[PDB]
């Protein structure tokens, strides 16, 4: 009945409890909250980091993770399956639900159409047909990353209350168009936590889907923080406490990534470097990984003592354990 | 020494004991029958369902399953390995046998020749060279499915004795020629259990290999049931207690599936629907999965309360645990 | 801090202790030396045998192995990652190091250049950036195989002291050029153990890289054994106690394997057979596997009671457990 599809679906108190359980697990990693239980990790797209953290997380709590990497499933109802689909998600979710206690789902968008991708069909289908809790391991939003990220910020600042912090979610250069998942999640969680958020991107075409812009706005009101869109690098970084980098192809160009290649390439200066970081208030830098060094961020920034990307990546483990424990 | 290659190899009392242990495991899933033991699940062909049930089954009994998906093995003796084969099954089975306590084998036929496929070389080779019990996870017969299927029928009818039940194994439409494995197993187990069996198919060309027809006949005599081949849909369904659907390419066409495409396509009416099911004696419907909705069976039949396909799929878990426990 | 990259890095006393712990584990396989611990098995190249032994080894000691098969990683520093690499080994090793207690690495050479391959970049990179012990699961040397091999010899001869034994590392025919890893390791460990070693190959072009020739020489001096290069089959086998076969492409031909195909094909007589084995002092035969029957060794030699290849393969399990236990 209760799933962990997006943090936006959980009340603030529930998210706070998850973060605290995550901190507790970080102090005592071995437990029995999942003793004799199991989780099916269904990866429609490969991920070494996510597979490792979840698999180990289940093991450490006495459970077992079954890793499934399909590779042809039909999600549409009343559809004559005479095509290339062998079985309907109805049967898949229901069968797995007779075996495991939880189901994790990872499904990256096709990038051939944001119009379709934004529907989150794969995840919504599992959540609808599954008799057991479903966990978003990343589709168009990365909720587990949000919490790992948030925990890392709380540990860094020495407090659970992040209000008053200047948070800068900056777009970054990449030779190819990327998913907005991490970006959408970053906006969601930074505002939900009540920080002064600024979405820094090259042009208005890079502004995130309305769904998330509304989420952020709605969260600003609840948390007492602030939101703001910007296109000026130097002013955005100024006096910033946190800088989060993430690359993503402008939504208005989904389907054809040819005329955009020259557009993104003229913005290879949005790379986070010491010059920019020095403008902040001794702010910290982080990225969700994988990160292309000297493209999204310079080797100097990465190896800096202000980069907490490795801590954030570690926290995926502790945060995902808190989620699995809450759902069982 | 003792393997679980086919149910036909086990006495009726042993099969009854397996089914009962399976029911016991269904009531108490956690156990120690495999404590510290392991099973190697060798999949020459991918299977999410079979991998999940076996892996979880080993975990629940205190054991560990190692999943191996090759992808070049030689099974022929005295064959100069100067071809594309790197190692002989002799070495593979013997080495794995020094590591694990049980070996599961899944190997779908090549469909390029039923003449060769019917030899069950992969399975027979493992059973011959392996120092530990071998388990058929599906090749040309699906013995684990047979028991999962049989258990589901016993639970549905509220009794272990299925004698007197009208069982209809019906062929079903599919855009492509399929393996007869599930069909051969269905005939084997339905007759072994003593039911009034009817093999419903379009033309005599779809009759199953003699090996299984003889098995069925031999089982009818032992169980006190009956066997019968039919080509009339309405008469077959009439007063039926159980309807099992399965698609499969006529054996006489193995090698060339071109002139058969038009032959099978003219029989897309063999699809199980409410019209047919209504003719039975409030009979139950089931399929081994994966099932193409609105092709092999209509969405109406699938979502009906008489469809026990999800229960049968669940039982793969309990039945496979009974098998692993009996073999160690 | 301490890794298991090559046996040559460990003192003789440490190697002796590993071999003894391995013998102890062979007598009592279940233990708690890895209770609650985990190892990441990173396979850049597939290996059923190595995956099975390590995974089971972790399970038997109360731990858990996470299997990762990438398939695009950058190992070069200060390299603008605008190519086909998504993330730097720096981030990979560091993140995995926050999750698991040990990291195993398997990476076969590209064969496109021994000049580059001999650098052991993949392994050295992991060992440099990883915060936890790294284990060579085979790159250009196969140290786990060395110990499995050595243990099998000690069990066969009924003593830990192998000094005085005539060891013949023979090159063998193969339709394609192979890695020297196993060959380099065989020379290393046979000399380190103090045996009378003879490297039997067709022509001086097949002599192993200087690195290992020096290693052997340096080991002969320490162990009191002997080294010797030979090109005469009959004289090499004569009075031999141990015969180890392994195929490998001459190092001087790395990059272009066309003019070598005809060169290796004229030496298909280097195959180990009863005629040759009969010349030894009732010597034992072994191979690391996979082995092409009737090409590297005849079916007669393989099925002989003097072939200890299956025992050596089994010992990978016990030896790898000793290594994992020593590193944690």
Curated annotation (Swiss-Prot), chains A, B, C:
Signal peptide: none annotated. It holds the Pfam family OTCace_N. GO terms for cellular component: cytoplasm. N(2)-acetyl-L-ornithine binds at residues 138, 246, 289. GO terms for biological process: arginine biosynthetic process via ornithine; citrulline biosynthetic process; L-arginine biosynthetic process. Its EC number is 2.1.3.9. Keywords: Amino-acid biosynthesis, Arginine biosynthesis, Cytoplasm, Transferase. Carbamoyl phosphate binds at residues 47-50, 106, 142-145, 288-289, 316. The modification N6-carboxylysine is found at residue 296. Carboxylation at Lys-296 increases the catalytic activity of the enzyme. Is potently inhibited by N(alpha)-acetyl-N(delta)-phosphonoacetyl-L-ornithine (PALAO). It is found in: Cytoplasm. Changing residue 296 to A/E/R: Significant decrease in enzymatic activity. The record marks 86 as: Key residue in conferring substrate specificity for N-acetyl-L-ornithine versus N-succinyl-L-ornithine. The keyword Transferase applies. Pathway: Amino-acid biosynthesis; L-arginine biosynthesis. It catalyses: N(2)-acetyl-L-ornithine + carbamoyl phosphate = N(2)-acetyl-L-citrulline + phosphate + H(+). Disulfide bonds: none annotated. GO terms for molecular function: amino acid binding; N-acetylornithine carbamoyltransferase activity; ornithine carbamoyltransferase activity. Homotrimer. Catalyzes the transfer of the carbamoyl group from carbamoyl phosphate to the delta-amino group of N(2)-acetyl-L-ornithine to produce N(2)-acetyl-L-citrulline. This is a step in an alternative arginine biosynthesis pathway. The enzyme has no activity with ornithine. Belongs to the aspartate/ornithine carbamoyltransferase superfamily. AOTCase family. This is N-acetylornithine carbamoyltransferase. The gene is argF'.
